[PDB]
Amino acid sequence: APKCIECHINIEMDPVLHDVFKLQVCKQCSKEHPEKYALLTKTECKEDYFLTDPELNDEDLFHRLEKPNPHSGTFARMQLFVRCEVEAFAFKKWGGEEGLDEEWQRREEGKAH
Amino acid sequence: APKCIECHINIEMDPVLHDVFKLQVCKQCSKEHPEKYALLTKTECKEDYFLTDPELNDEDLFHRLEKPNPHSGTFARMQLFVRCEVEAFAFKKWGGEEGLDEEWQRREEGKAHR
DNA sequence: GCTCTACTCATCA
């Protein structure tokens, strides 16, 4: 029986993380480790990691799950990305957490001026 | 036989203006009235009339002729629009020739700022 | 804590 890669105990994987994101992780372990497994909206990815629309629209770069827009089914679909992929791309791009914060620090300044 | 709408004499229409732009205009009248019949590139339409990419990209709005990009076949194709259509849309948008010139006047100022 | 892009120019294509 294949095991969850975090606990090595559960054998029933979370259907979203497994099927959409290709992660053999159980639902419990996913709540226990949001730092790796939380789902982020497109908008949160841009706020948190400073990724651009072109990066987040690239079908070849991230797995994504889509849902109806909660404000209205007639609006553009909500797009959910998994934190570990988004973060790994953001660290490659800005140079680790070290660099990402530099860019946070940067944007906060011009925020005033 | 049907006659050119500018001269009322010629019977063979310019192939581009007829087939692509639906104007029964002979080639000679087209050279004689560029103020209506000259063909403008996409970039020229933006420069001259302050039309935006969404307006010029709207397939339902203007007739267009496409050619190979003269800088390179591998670049984005060149797009040619006929001045009467582009001008008539621009006068509607900015308010005749008059409003258009105000927008010229306006844009030269912010240019001086920088 | 929703998404998409229009809102004047280098650069690349």
Next chain:
DNA sequence: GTGATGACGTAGAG
């Protein structure tokens, strides 16, 4: 006198 768009961010519509 070539075309398309991303680039300090973001309102507004959707």
